Amino acid sequence: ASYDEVRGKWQDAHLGKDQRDFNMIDLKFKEEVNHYSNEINKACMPFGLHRQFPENSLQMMVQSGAKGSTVNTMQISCLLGQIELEGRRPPLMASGKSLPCFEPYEFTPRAGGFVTGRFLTGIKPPEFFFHCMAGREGLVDTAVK
Amino acid sequence: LPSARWQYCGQRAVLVQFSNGKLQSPGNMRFTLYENKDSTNPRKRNQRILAAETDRLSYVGNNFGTGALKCNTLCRHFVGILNKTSGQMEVYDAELFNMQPLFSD
Amino acid sequence: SCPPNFTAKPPASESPRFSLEALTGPDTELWLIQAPADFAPECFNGRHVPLSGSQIVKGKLAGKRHRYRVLSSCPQAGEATLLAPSTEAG
Amino acid sequence: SSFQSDLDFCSDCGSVLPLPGAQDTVTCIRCGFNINVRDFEGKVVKTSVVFHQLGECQGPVVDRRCPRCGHEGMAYHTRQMRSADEGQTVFYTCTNCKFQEKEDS
Amino acid sequence: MNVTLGIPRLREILMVASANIKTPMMSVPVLNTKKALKRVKSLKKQLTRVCLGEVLQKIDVQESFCMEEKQNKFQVYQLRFQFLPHAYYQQEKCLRPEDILRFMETRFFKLLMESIKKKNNKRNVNTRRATQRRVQAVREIHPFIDDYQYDTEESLWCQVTVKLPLMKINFDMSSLVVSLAHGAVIYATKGITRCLLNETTNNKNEKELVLNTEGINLPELFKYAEVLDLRRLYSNDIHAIANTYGIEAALRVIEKEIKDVFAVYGIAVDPRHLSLVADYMCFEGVYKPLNRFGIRSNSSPLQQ
Amino acid sequence: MDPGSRWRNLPSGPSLKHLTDPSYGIPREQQKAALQELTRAHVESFNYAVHEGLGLAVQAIPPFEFAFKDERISFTILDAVISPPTVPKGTICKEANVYPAECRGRRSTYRGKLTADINWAVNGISKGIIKQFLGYVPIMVKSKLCNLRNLPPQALIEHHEEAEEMGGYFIINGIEKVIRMLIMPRRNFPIAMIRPKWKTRGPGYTQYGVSMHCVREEHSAVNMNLHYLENGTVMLNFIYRKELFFLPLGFALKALVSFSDYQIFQELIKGKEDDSFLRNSVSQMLRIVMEEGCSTQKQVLNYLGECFRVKLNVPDWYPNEQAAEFLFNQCICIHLKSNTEKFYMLCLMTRKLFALAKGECMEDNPDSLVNQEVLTPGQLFLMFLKEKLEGWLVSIKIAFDKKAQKTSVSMNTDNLMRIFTMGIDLTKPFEYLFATGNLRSKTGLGLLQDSGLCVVADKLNFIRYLSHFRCVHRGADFAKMRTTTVRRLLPESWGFLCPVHTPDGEPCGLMNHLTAVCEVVTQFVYTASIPALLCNLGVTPIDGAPHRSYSECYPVLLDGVMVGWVDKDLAPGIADSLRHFKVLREKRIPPWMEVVLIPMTGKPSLYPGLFLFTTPCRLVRPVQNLALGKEELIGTMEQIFMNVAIFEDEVFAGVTTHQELFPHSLLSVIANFIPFSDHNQSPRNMYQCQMGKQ
Ligand SMILES: [Zn+2]
Ligand SMILES: [Zn+2]
């Protein structure tokens, strides 16, 4: 099937009042992009840091229970990973484009919030707007209820 | 690729809308048109009232009142003929009326 | 019962006829050309207007070679019917 | 000199005819033009209400030993549940025994 | 399945001690004997509520007109009902499509001809609201039926040709038919919405099939004993165990229904705190709430 | 980047050389043109709303005719002006003007005299004209009525004010109080809504409905609803002074036009012609009007002027045909002068409701900034001033009805006029809105809330003080809900509201702040030549017939007025030649127009059309149109259909049509001041934006 036919099928999955076959295309990108969120962390995090444990101060604070976790260090020195927003990928607009940068119904994981850049080197502006959605979601769900 | 020849002559070819349907059956219907008096203003070339009486009802059509269509001020209307013998689309000037039937006061 | 069949008009009056044609025969094909609000009609005064499709016809005033675009059409059964004045009824 | 309106409207004025009833002719109210009820045989109005026309590995893994079954890898999900003054919150979820614990950083 | 989580479940237990609770369940394991596993596939189906707006594809209303005499002039209707195919539900009763036609032939039309003669028999407003906000058996049902036509090769449609007389206003028969088509078909088993045996879960390597229904009817499941191991039944409803299994097992249900509210949210409470709450609420024999209507039982006026 | 872009003067890097210079401490003779673009929507709106809008809002006050003992006293306000603030007359002083620095230090109000020309007339003959002092209204600093207007920075240090005194604030009793920018619904536009609270409004309603926020010349505001019903019948609700009115659709459209019922039949079936339920329902709605013996327009007007006369509070001497055109003048589509273009608008609202009820167009999200605009301090000033002028006239009527009892000499007036001494004085009822923020109105002014309008501009530092003039407050009633959808960041707020700059507690998601590039449209222009321009392009107007059939033709809606029907093979080629006039400033296309072509896909997407917005009080932001090479003010609804690009490398051929100016344009003024924002986590930035303001 050509990409315009698949794109028309995913436009038809969108715009419908079922919203059940659209929550099944989220659950198949959010699998395939987390087989790339793990293959990065196996290549960079344990034996790929500059100084390892016990010389590493961040690994000492994480592994000796002081403050951190092995998720914050991977958001620092590897990818941020998939941005989930109340369970799912960030909302498409009313015209089927993820953000004004991205083409209507764009297949790439960058359209659905797969940030793949770290807090070490830098976040580009789309991967930043998605991240601000995921932060305001938690701050709102705390501050209201 | 069919073509023609534009030739503008200048007269008004009156065009009629009906507020109730297509005509589809021409028969025994009068047609008269009631222009304004004073020609010093341009009201002689603008004000006009069309009367189309039938034995059942009679139809009035204006150019100035609340009910006059806005397709003759924001757009110009022509009428072609296309004399295909000499091969010319000689083109006149037109004006569109929309007639309401007259009932009471 | 009692319809009006109106003839009441205070500032108006009837009018005579014009010396145009009164014929719609087998050769004459009625076209209903719809022109923009400031169109000077001598601007196409010998040019080919198309009878199908679309074609960028040239203007006259600015001399531009594709200044207007004449859109041809199809049978729409447009409800406007021509009242051409006839010679049998003055 | 009859027109072509819709079946439900008068064809001399444009007003709405009422429904049929106790007679063989339905009449208008402002022109007296009566149409037969026999002409309303072709009034067929359709309607279709439709009900049922058609018919993540819980996230990315991290090598953390589970409290219950002792599997080496749990799947995680981050969420920022405190205020903006402090913290994140990480929700781990195992693959085998599906156990869910949380941490506050 | 889903339950009520958090504080409005703990308040539902301790503070109101509700008789009618939101989302109540019921859990019975299966004998794990090969005769009693074919039967549970059928019994999951025979307790789910199959509703008419769940097997129906589309309603096709078609109003016309018909006149033959000076009085015989009518409004012919026609209600073609496409039913969704049998392949599109293998979860509800094995409801073979002749049964959703015999439902129509028996007791849909008794509701339809009562809604019709309740509506018209005794929008346009300017009120200025002053506030802010067998075909011979089907024709026997009423003489307004003119025709009936069901599908014979397959079993998917139905056409009542209701022949009503003339009115002043034209009421909607795609509003009465749609609102009547939200209704239970043949069996809604009394107080059970759906059944879910899809848990093959186990705690100490049993492979224990667990039914987990969304409604509560205790004597409905008591008559399935060779297939359901009713020794290990459970419920949320303390009032449906105090009145069937007693107050001394409606006290080992309060403890588990508090522990399985705190343990959704990771919290673990010591069972010596919970057995002090179950043995206080079940002290007078009934399941009292800890509110203003459980302080009337107390003895000190200066505490009340 | 284009010269004139306001962002050509953006520095490459920070300099630090401006604090070791001999120029440091010498006041310039020109205020900086970048700190004045932050109170521009506050000051320009007040400039429209004390000079042009006040003359256009004493024309929309109708003449006030009431009954004396068998005469007929008639009033009208011919003109009303506001003087800049002076000292009271009789004061022995040298400089008669009053400056803001006096009113801060003495704790008084910076207020200007309001006075008007009332035209009293008994029995229809104009017998006088009286210049009456009505009261004092507060003056905005650095507007066209402040005494600091166009002073240079050296003459502003002399009058105790700061250099770089950007305006935007009222001194009310010595305390500086800004009117913040609330979010109102998008003006003069159908909004497809689905709300199940509407099912319990009448006998047989459905959830489906179309709303419209109608505003007339920035001085009146009225919401009206349509509702689909299970019959296919359409109703039309509107509130007029706490009295919700029900009105069928045929009763509206017959009262508006003198067309026959076959044309009102035809206008509502234009796209959907083969449908059978729709034609039946639009027949029933007109038959309802035929029921009560109302066959013409004047009979419907007499009927609705007899049903709706006791709550409209019209006088006891109108004909009912004029007491029914009173409700169409003040409740139903106030933004169109013609009763014909109210009709062609109720037909489009009705057809959007028909395509919503059938499930062929999706709900317009009411919370998205696609369908939201901002309320400027020129709207809330002009609306409330208009209402208080009408209330002053009503207080003159109450003064006469109280003078009639315990009767005085009570002669014919002939400029006696001690009544105007005893008229109401709007010094205090106009000061109260600013001093407390509590709006006090018998109308509601088209607003959905009552309190939270004026906020104390605190000045604890200068980070805090800017961000009172960039605040976009969602609502002062949504703080108490258990919602999350009205306070969630959506992707249509790219470029228009800042993702990080919001508080984190209870006002999270409500108090948004604008981005740096974004700007509120406040310049009011005229739309005279635009319909003729559109019809010179392929817009076949409403009355003529398009050369292809309808349903292959888009509606065109020029700022609330239905214009025509564009052929489908022309509407992409019209949306390009109206952006190629906006970016080049041709043919009186304003630079802030939204050419929005919602396309025809054949799927339940948004309702298709070609919607051109030119009205003020929207949001707009600049980009670079790549095809020409010039700056384009993209609005809130255009950029859900445009493929903008952030970086030059991300610009492709044929796909990409625009480009943002500088790639950190999505961030507010305060969130830019955070160094290395792309390296720290997002609640750290949302917490830093409220550290810097403390
Ligand atoms: Zn008639
Ligand atoms: Zn585990």
Residue numbers in the entry:
A (entry chain A): 837 to 981
B (entry chain M): 6 to 15, 21 to 115
C (entry chain N): 13 to 102
D (entry chain I): 11 to 65, 77 to 126
E (entry chain A): 1239 to 1360, 1365 to 1375, 1501 to 1671
F (entry chain B): 1 to 694
Publication excerpt:
RNA polymerase I (Pol I) is one of three eukaryotic RNA polymerases and is specialized in the transcription of ribosomal RNA (rRNA). rRNA constitutes 80–90% of the total RNA mass in mammalian cells.
In the Pol I–RRN3 complex, clear cryo-EM density corresponding to RRN3 is visible close to the stalk. It contacts the stalk and residues 468–542 (dock) of subunit RPA1. In human Pol I, the main interaction site for RRN3 is the RPA43 subunit. The absence of a human subunit equivalent to yeast A14 introduces a hinge in the middle of the stalk-forming subunit. This allows the upper part of the stalk to swing away by ~5 Å upon RRN3 binding, while the bottom part remains anchored to the Pol I core. The structures of Pol I–RRN3 and Pol I OC represent inactive states of human Pol I, with RPA12 being inserted into the funnel, an unfolded bridge helix and trigger loop, and a conserved (yet weakly bound) DNA-mimicking loop.
